[PDB]
Amino acid sequence: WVIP
Amino acid sequence: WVIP
Amino acid sequence: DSCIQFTRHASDVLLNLNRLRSRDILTDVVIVVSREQFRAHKTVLMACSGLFYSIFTDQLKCNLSVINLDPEINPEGFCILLDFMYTSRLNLREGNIMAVMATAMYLQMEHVVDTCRKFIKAS
Amino acid sequence: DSCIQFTRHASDVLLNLNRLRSRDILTDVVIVVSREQFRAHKTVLMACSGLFYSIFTDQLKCNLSVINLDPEINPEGFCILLDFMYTSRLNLREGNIMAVMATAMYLQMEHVVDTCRKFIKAS
Ligand SMILES: CN(C)c1ncc(Cl)c(Nc2ccc3c(c2)CC(=O)N3)n1
Ligand SMILES: CN(C)c1ncc(Cl)c(Nc2ccc3c(c2)CC(=O)N3)n1
Numbered sequence: 620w621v622i623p
Numbered sequence: 624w625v626i627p
Numbered sequence: 628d629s630c631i632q633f634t635r636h637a638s639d640v641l642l643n644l645n646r647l648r649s650r651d652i653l654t655d656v657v658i659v660v661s662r663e664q665f666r667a668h669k670t671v672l673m674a675c676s677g678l679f680y681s682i683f684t685d686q687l688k689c690n691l692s693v694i695n696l697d698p699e700i701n702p703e704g705f706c707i708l709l710d711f712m713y714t715s716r717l718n719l720r721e722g723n724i725m726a727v728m729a730t731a732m733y734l735q736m737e738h739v740v741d742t743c744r745k746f747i748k749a750s
Numbered sequence: 751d752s753c754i755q756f757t758r759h760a761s762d763v764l765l766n767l768n769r770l771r772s773r774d775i776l777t778d779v780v781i782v783v784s785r786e787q788f789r790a791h792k793t794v795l796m797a798c799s800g801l802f803y804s805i806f807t808d809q810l811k812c813n814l815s816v817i818n819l820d821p822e823i824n825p826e827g828f829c830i831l832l833d834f835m836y837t838s839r840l841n842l843r844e845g846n847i848m849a850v851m852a853t854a855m856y857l858q859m860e861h862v863v864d865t866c867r868k869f870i871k872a873s
């Protein structure tokens with residue numbers, strides 16, 4: 620999971 | 624396009 | 628093999644499937660969550676959820692145009708997860724994380740359950 | 751928004767859609783190319799091809815279970831492109847590049863046409  |  | 632690969636292809640496919648959903652094009656099922664109705668593509672639901680995968684591979688349920696979820700399922704939690712299925716983006720907030728995790732456990736969306744468990748452990 | 755994103759989600763969705771295709775699950779159309787028949791999901795075809803997008807948004811053609819392609823279309827070129835749609839992988843070879851480019855131009859798959867033009871220009 621990432622900060623888009 | 625890339626070499627997978 | 629000796630194939631070449633287009634990096635953005637999968638993301639572009641999902642973006643177009645979401646555009647079809649937003650215009651209600653070729654949607655073939657309505658998911659009923661309490662009073663709320665959500666139109667979707669059976670194939671996308673199956674590709675994202677262990678529960679829908681089991682439902683739509685069943686020889687009788689594969690033909691249903693309406694699926695009713697367990698009354699304990701929260702419509703907002705479902706809406707956030709349906710958006711995630713079609714975008715890869717999860718709107719996880721303090722006020723919805725418990726409903727999102729419970730819905731993801733029911734829908735069998737392992738990666739969402741994992742990030743909810745980690746975000747809860749941090750707080 | 752304040753969303754988080756699962757990097758591998760789109761790729762995982764496409765991988766599952768290809769698994770459904772390989773097992774012939776919820777396929778809703780057969781594409782006829784000369785003597786050859788190819789089963790697929792209308793939504794995936796639309797998401798990948800400007801031609802299928804136009805066909806299946808048409809109020810009459812959207813309901814067809816069989817689509818016949820122009821007799822000039824090569825079944826192998828179509829097969830390579832159908833595999834690309836479901837995998838992001840293109841089996842481009844010296845012996846098939848002309849048939850692949852011609853099929854991609856007909857199917858309106860802009861990114862495939864672009865890489866074929868570049869590979870032809872190099873040789
Ligand atoms: C497991 N399998 C062969 C398969 N083939 C096709 C599809 Cl659409 C599919 N989808 C599915 C099954 C289980 C799970 C998911 C999708 C997501 C998840 O967390 N569990 N799973
Ligand atoms: C253009 N548009 C709004 C849209 N919405 C939904 C879908 Cl499924 C779609 N697909 C499509 C249309 C044109 C093209 C492609 C897909 C690939 C391409 O090279 N051209 N295009």
Ligand SMILES: [Cl-]
Nearest residue numbers: 736737738739
């Ligand atoms: Cl997931």
Ligand SMILES: [Cl-]
Nearest residue numbers: 859860861862
């Ligand atoms: Cl393309």
